């Protein structure tokens, strides 16, 4: 019965490999508030609290806005926890993400934990991306690195928990 610790984590990736999916099925299988969104709804907010730990998660979400821009400096501020998504179908989306991570790096604090999810794992029949280079440009970026599906669930409460476990207290 002790303190809730919140942190911001952020989506990132191209349009389309499923960064808005992930949150909602995440958010399905937990407690959480109803969502919110920023002036304009520029970006979409979820709080959502992951069962059997005093972890809060403020999670923010884009409008679409990445298959046109950038992202904005105060989509990246406070950010604690991100988890840039790539399609294994898509071998772009999956140089994309590299970019991501870069951009995150740099505009986020050094002790941010990063995760890389290859989504759409569940169309494994036409994957695009192996596993093991996904792997190995995670290991050396120390990121932690799962494939998931949103449409199937497959690892969504885990790449969440693996977060949440690398987060201070
Ligand atoms: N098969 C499959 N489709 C997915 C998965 N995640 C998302 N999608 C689909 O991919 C499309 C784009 O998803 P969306 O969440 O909007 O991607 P975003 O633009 O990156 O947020 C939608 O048709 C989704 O239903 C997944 O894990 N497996
Ligand atoms: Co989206």
Not at 27 to 52: M, N, P, R, W, Y
Not at 136 to 164: C, R
Request: charge should be neutral; charged fraction near 20%.
């Amino acid at each position: 019965g002790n303190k809730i610790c919140q942190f911001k984590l952020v989506l990132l990736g191209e349009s389309a490999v499923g960064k808005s999916s992930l949150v909602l099925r995440f958010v399905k299988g937990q407690f959480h508030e109803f969502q919110e969104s920023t002036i304009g709804a520029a970006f979409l907010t979820q709080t959502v609290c992951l069962d059997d730990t005093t972890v809060k998660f403020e999670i923010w979400d884009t409008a679409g806005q990445e298959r046109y821009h950038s992202l904005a400096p105060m989509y990246y501020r406070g950010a604690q926890a991100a988890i840039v998504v790539y399609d294994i179908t898509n071998e772009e989306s999956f140089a994309r993400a590299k970019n991501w991570v870069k951009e995150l790096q740099r505009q986020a604090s050094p002790n941010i934990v990063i995760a890389l999810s290859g989504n759409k794992a569940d169309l494994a029949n036409k994957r695009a991306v192996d596993f093991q280079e996904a792997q190995s440009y995670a290991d050396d970026n120390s990121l932690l690195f799962m494939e998931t599906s949103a449409k199937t669930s497959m690892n969504v409460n885990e790449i969440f928990m693996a977060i949440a476990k690398k987060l201070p207290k």
